[PDB]
Structure 1
Amino acid sequence: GAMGSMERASLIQKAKLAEQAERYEDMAAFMKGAVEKGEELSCEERNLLSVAYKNVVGGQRAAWRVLSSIEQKSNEGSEEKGPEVREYREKVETELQGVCDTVLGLLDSHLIKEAGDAESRVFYLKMKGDYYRYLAEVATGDDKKRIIDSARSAYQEAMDISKKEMPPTNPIRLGLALNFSVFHYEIANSPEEAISLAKTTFDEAMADLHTLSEDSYKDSTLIMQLLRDNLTLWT
């Protein structure tokens, strides 16, 4: 790998600089190099990995949605324009799939198997569900159902651990539940499960806020608002 000659600490330092410069592709490459050093990631380092790839894939998903919509309209009274829209949508789609496969590969070799604490294991399993979810958004062929089930299975294992090992206000647990609820609504055609999950998560967090410091209260209530935003949109 092209980061093989750079010190782990320097990769982390440069990932933080790339974040400040909004250079998320660089940030992701630096964090991939850091993961490939083979040592486990601290909490801050895990967040850097997630921020980098979420931003890279988020731009790819936004572009794919623009191009997919143009492609949809072209296939309605619409004039034939040739293969270009499909080709370019496919190009962006293949790039997106490549990023998802890269992230999933880092999780499989070997972040998840070395993650023993609940906070790291839940974090990585949530990421696995997220990146299979992004693959599912663009899937159409023989493995769409298997891709969806891979996302479900990762989210489910993360939920089981998070419920047993974390308080209901833990921001990792809240963000996992938020994303699993989105999976239910957007991927699994299960809006009732999505609503039930978001509501139960919100209510159980509400009841636990009294145990928190002012700073933790701020952290948890911010994610609760994201759950509330979805419930308002979905109900």
Structure 2
Amino acid sequence: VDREQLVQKARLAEQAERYDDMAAAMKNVTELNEPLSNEERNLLSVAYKNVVGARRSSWRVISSIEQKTSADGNEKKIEMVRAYREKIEKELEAVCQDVLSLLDNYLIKNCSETQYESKVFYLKMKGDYYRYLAEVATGEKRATVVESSEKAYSEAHEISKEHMQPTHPIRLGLALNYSVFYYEIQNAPEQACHLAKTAFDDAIAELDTLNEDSYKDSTLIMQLLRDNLTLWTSD
């Protein structure tokens, strides 16, 4: 199959809500070792976000049941629940490793020196999928993926600050997820609030830089940055 047919299969699967088929198609496109367009980049992101998202949602539901089931003290039930959580965990981890290998061996690798937007987009993705791994990990395994997530976000933040405008949706989007990482994963609310406030204040200072085509996308993230800050400074 030619590249165009694969991109069109991903577009069909998205409409058919068959995200495993969409991810498979976009993985094949990535494996052609040619750079992805803005459309192709988002098709891949949406596909894998929905695939991992299904496991994340299931894991949260099972974990919630596991916490309640542990209280009643039902030996046979607790093990069955624990085992099911582990089954979903393994599925989630496999999806993350699948994404992370595409990012490390194809996507980040093929970014040119001047391709700043793509480099930030993929490093943010790297940060996100290591954060999704952190969400389910414990002990030293958790410490490892948390370190990896920080390294990816930190690199993306340095590039975006240097080459992207504070109002850029990719830059704001990274600041949103990186602040979420600080609060939820690192349990650093002071660092989380500082990052979210700086990103919001810098974008507010240069509202004149908003692009007619992406102003709505930027303001949507800016709202989430304030919503999170309001929440974090209430708690």
The structural deviation recorded for 1:79 is: 2.9
Indicate the residue corresponding to 1:59 in structure 2: 54
State how far apart, in whole Å, the 2-side matches of 1:190 and 1:70 are. 28
State how far apart, in whole Å, the 1-side matches of 2:212 and 2:142 are. 44
User: TM (normalized to structure 2)?
Assistant: 0.94
- Any idea what the Cα deviations from partners look like across 1:119-139, whole Å, max 9, x if unmatched? 010010000000000000000
Which of 91, 95, 101 aligns to 1:95? It is 91
Tell me if structure 2 keeps the 8 A contact 1:209–1:217.
no
Amino acid at match of 1:93: E
Indicate the residue corresponding to 1:29 in structure 2: 24
Indicate the residue corresponding to 1:18 in structure 2: 13
State how far apart, in whole Å, the 2-side matches of 1:110 and 1:217 are. 31
Identity %: 67
State how far apart, in whole Å, the 2-side matches of 1:171 and 1:135 are. 25
SS across alignment from 1:198: helix
Q: What is the count of residue pairs matched by the alignment? A: 230
Indicate the residue corresponding to 1:180 in structure 2: 178
Tell me if structure 1 keeps the 8 A contact 2:167–2:209.
no
Tell me if structure 2 keeps the 8 A contact 1:15–1:30.
yes
Structure 1 outlier segments of 4+, above 4 Å: none
Indicate the residue corresponding to 2:151 in structure 1: 153
RMSD, aligned α-carbons = 1.2
Greater shift in the superposed pair: 16-25 or 179-188? 16-25
5 Å-filtered alignment, 1:67-146, equals 67-82=62-77, 83-116=79-112, 117-146=115-144
Which of 218, 223, 226 aligns to 1:225? It is 223
Indicate the residue corresponding to 1:3 in structure 2: none
State how far apart, in whole Å, the 2-side matches of 1:231 and 1:215 are. 27
- Any idea what the Cα deviations from partners look like across 1:140-162, whole Å, max 9, x if unmatched? 13321111000000000000000
State how far apart, in whole Å, the 2-side matches of 1:213 and 1:67 are. 43
SS across alignment from 2:74: coil
The structural deviation recorded for 1:13 is: 0.7
The structural deviation recorded for 1:210 is: 1.6
SS across alignment from 2:214: helix
SS across alignment from 1:218: helix
SS across alignment from 2:167: coil
Amino acid at match of 2:156: A
Q: Which runs of 5+ in 1 are unaligned?
A: 1-5
User: TM (normalized to structure 1)?
Assistant: 0.94
